[PDB]
Each structure stands twice: as structure tokens, then as C-alpha cells.
Amino acid sequence: TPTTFVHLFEWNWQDVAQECEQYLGPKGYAAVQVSPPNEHITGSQWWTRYQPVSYELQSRGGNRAQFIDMVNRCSAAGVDIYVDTLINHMAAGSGTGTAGNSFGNKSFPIYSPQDFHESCTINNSDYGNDRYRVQNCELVGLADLDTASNYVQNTIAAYINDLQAIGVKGFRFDASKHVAASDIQSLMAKVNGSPVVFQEVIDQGGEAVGASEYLSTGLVTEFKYSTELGNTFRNGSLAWLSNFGEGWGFMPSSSAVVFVDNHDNQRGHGGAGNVITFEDGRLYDLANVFMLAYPYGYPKVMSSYDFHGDTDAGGPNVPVHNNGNLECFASNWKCEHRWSYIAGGVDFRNNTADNWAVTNWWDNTNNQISFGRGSSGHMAINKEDSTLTATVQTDMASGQYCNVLKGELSADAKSCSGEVITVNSDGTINLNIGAWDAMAIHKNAKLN
Ligand SMILES: [Ca+2]
């Protein structure tokens, strides 16, 4: 069952299409969130994508034909496409777009100065005590669209509807906090059918505008998850995660999009240094394994590029699929979605989707934990400095299982490529997990 999606950050349309056929589809990823496909300002920085010029599908990722080709090919592979949609603003200042269009002084090919709110600057203190300014003023100089305007709502809705006609199945509403929930409600009334919509709302608490305000218009990014997970993994005890989720004050599980990190917070925007990223190696593996095994939210796996400490830099000057060579795992594209523990966690989540309870939780009061998903699967994480050798109780059928974090079941089901885990006749497992390692087994990766 499809349960997880991935963000192919700055991946061009040809690389995504190929990734869908060769990897995402076969491995079970539900969908792909692509970078903004519309016309945006010129420049090499990754953030140019967040300054729209028009809704023409001519961007750094490719042209309209390549985009349509990507949707079709991904769709055939069983993978949906979610489009990062800019509903709050247009480009700042003046200049030229990726499709040749000129703009300037809030004058764009599809909007006039009258289609924007009167200019004012959002100040940091406005977040805590002035919802009017947060939603009507400019976010770092970006022209703030008058989202209450029928013309503006029709224009954005037409774009969304055009994407659905092409085959796009979902949408990410960028900077949703900066748009009144009621404006989004009016917008959605113009959207055909019921596509998957998730809204970016950064709410760690103490904001004038809250995440709960967007629950009736779709899913909402739960930023507390990323921050607390990172904080617990680095500075706390894993034992504390036994009631992670609503128990910690998070929004309803069925309404949340969760992640270890995202394109913003891995660069210091919306997250401090406690956020765990690819740079943390094995710590990142372990954090993803917990997220993917734990039954809270709709997880989004991150797929980054090594930015070499430059938080403004755009992606690599080389494609992922480069003349038969895969530009992954090194100093270009990181391809975390292909990392063994991460793809294995996705497999675990996909095969335990028939039991969303956390069963038989066990911990050593500190950094060793183990829990099951009923008789569908079991997992354990060892973040201590000594081997985890405890005997844990599971509800699983006795037999031999492939530790899916380190390998997989062969076609004929007679062998695994990685280590084997034995479930004894009484349902127990005598663990043998080294420091900073983990194991996960499920009913669909059982031997012979
Ligand atoms: Ca706004």
C-alpha cells in the first residue's frame, strides 16, 4: 500500500520521469513533490523558484512538453505528482522570467498592481501579535497577492485545474500561513474535484496565525515533528518517543505531513541546528527509520543535493541520470530516497499499513527502543554505545525474516540479500544490534 512520498528538490523533469520508472514505482513511493513548474525569475539560486512571473510551465525544470511527459510516465509507473503551488505572492522587484516574460512594479503578464495588497513589510514580531500584517504584508519583499479578489482566485484556480487536466494529483500550497484560511476556502470552491492538498504552515507555538486554522482545507505540515524528532535524537532519550504525536501536542495524525527535514529547514529557515539532515549520516538513517516505522502522519522523504555550506546555491550542474551513470551519494545529488535504511523504512511502512497501532513497546529507559505494528511487523533501534541484545516480544509468526533495512527478499523468497532475523516459536526475538544500527521486519519479507 502506498504510504510515503518524496521531495525531489530541484530535480529536472527528465530525471524525475526516469526516477519514477526505475526506482520510485518499483520501491513503492506513493508520489513525488516537484519544485515549482511555473515561470519564475532567472538566476541560479534555488529560491528563484519561489518568485513566480506567470503560470506558464517553462521553468528551470524544463518546458511544458517535458513536464507533461513526466506526469504521464510517472503515472504509468504508479507514482503521483504533487505540484508546489505559490498561492501567496509573485516575484519581488523587476526583471525577466524563464519564459521570456518581463515584469516590474507589481506589473506581471497576468496581474496588475491592483491585484496585490498595498505594500508593507512583515516584521518578525508580527508573527506573534499581528495576523493582519502576517497575511496582508510582504514576505521578504514578495508582492503579496490579494487572495480575497475573485480575479486572483480564478487565476490560481485555473492554473490548478489545468494541472489536474494534465494529470497532476496533488498540490503543496506554499506559504499558506500568509494567506487567510477563508481565502483558501474560497479558492478551493473553484478547484475541480478533490485533489490531495497539503499546506505549508510553520507553527511551533505562540503564533498569531495557527496551523489548526488550515485543517478544513487539507493536510498541514507539522513542523513540530521535524524539530522534536531532531531534538530527541540528538539531545534526548528515544524512550520518550513512546507516545510521540498528539500526545506531544501535535495536530491530528490524519491531518499531518511529517518529515525529518525539508528544503528550508536543512538550510536554517524554520529550523535550528538540531534538525537532522543528510550531513548527519547514520543519525539521519536512524531518524528516518523511526519516522517511517511509527504510525503518525503522512511522511515525506527528503532528497537533497550537497550544497557545500552555501545556503543560497542551486543544484548540481549535472543530471542525476548522466549517460548511464547515476550521480547519487557523493558531492552532487545525495539521493536519500535510495539510501538502504530509508528505502527499507518505506518498505516497512508500506507493508504494515493494515495495522496502525504501536504494539509491545520496549525501551531501556534511554536510547534503545523496539516496537511492533501488531503481527504485520516489528522494529528496533540501538542508539547506545553497546550492543542491544535484549529479548523482545512480538506478535509475529515464527520463522526467518529479512532485515529490510539492510537487504531484501529474493523473487523466489528463498533468501535475503542482508541479515536474517529469527522470530522464535513464542514470538520473541533475541536481538543482536550493534551501536547506532537498527532492524525492521514485516510479514511480507518472510523466508521460504
Ligand atoms: Ca498574503
UniProtKB/Swiss-Prot annotation:
One of its GO terms (biological process) is carbohydrate metabolic process. It is found in: Secreted. Requires chloride ions for optimal activity. One of its GO terms (cellular component) is extracellular region. Thermolabile. Its EC number is 3.2.1.1. Binds 1 Ca(2+) ion per subunit. It comes from the Bacteria. Ca(2+) binds at residues 88, 135, 144, 178. Chloride binds at residues 172, 262, 300. The active site is at 174 (nucleophile), 200 (proton donor). Changing residue 300 to Q: Abolishes chloride binding and reduces catalytic rate. The record marks 264 as: Transition state stabilizer. Keywords: Calcium, Carbohydrate metabolism, Chloride, Disulfide bond, Glycosidase, Hydrolase, Metal-binding, Secreted, Signal. Substrate binds at residues 47-51, 89, 172, 177-178, 207, 264, 269. Disulfide bonds join 20-74, 120-137, 328-335, 402-416. GO terms for molecular function: alpha-amylase activity; metal ion binding. Its cofactor is Ca(2+); chloride. Monomer. Belongs to the glycosyl hydrolase 13 family. This is Alpha-amylase. The gene is amy. The chain holds residues 25 to 472 of 669 of the full protein.
